[PDB]
Design a protein that fits this description.
9 strands; Lipocalin; mainly beta; pyrrolidone carboxylic acid; globular
Length: 174
């Protein structure tokens, strides 16, 4: 297909009154939707956790924790506060091959249960974007999942670009 373009940022809400010290800690990636088509017959992915550690310099250390064969992998990046609370840039942008832009926008959260976060990068001179549905728990309600589907579709993503990863016991509980 044609690339699904990133929506104008006007179409991506910013969570009002974002509180960095309440968004801290571990989130499970309960849902994921990206502008590349799932893959078609693919193995359902195992759930990852993402830990947001608020540092004293006001950035987050962001650690993705995942299972692979009899091992756990941790990958760290830095989110640096952007122009408005709840927006971030990538601290490592200047070392990422082919990357010219990276934006994080926290769309919605209640801090103690769920969040939705929008990501947009320009890599190899093309737009990539994705939305994550975070839970403080590995499972969320049908209402929250449905709201995530609706929001994903509102940004142009077809249903078959939306993935609900499978909870696992390894790695992601620390």
């Amino acid at each position: 297909s044609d690339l699904i373009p990133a929506p104008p940022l006007s179409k991506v809400p910013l969570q009002q009154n974002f509180q960095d010290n309440q968004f801290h800690g571990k989130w499970y990636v309960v849902g994921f939707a990206e502008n590349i088509q799932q893959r078609e017959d693919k193995d359902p992915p195992k759930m990852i956790a993402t830990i947001y550690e608020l540092k004293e310099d006001k950035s987050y250390n962001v650690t993705n924790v995942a299972s692979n064969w009899e091992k756990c992998t941790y990958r760290i990046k830095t989110f640096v506060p952007g122009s408005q609370p709840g927006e971030f840039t990538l601290g490592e942008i200047k070392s990422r091959p082919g990357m010219t832009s990276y934006l994080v926008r926290v769309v919605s959260t209640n801090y103690n249960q769920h969040a939705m976060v929008f990501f947009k990068t320009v890599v190899q001179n093309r737009e990539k974007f994705w939305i994550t549905l975070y839970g403080r728990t590995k499972e969320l309600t049908s209402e929250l999942k449905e709201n995530f589907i609706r929001f994903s579709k509102s940004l142009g993503l077809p249903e078959n670009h939306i993935v609900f990863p499978v909870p696992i016991d390894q790695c992601i509980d620390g």
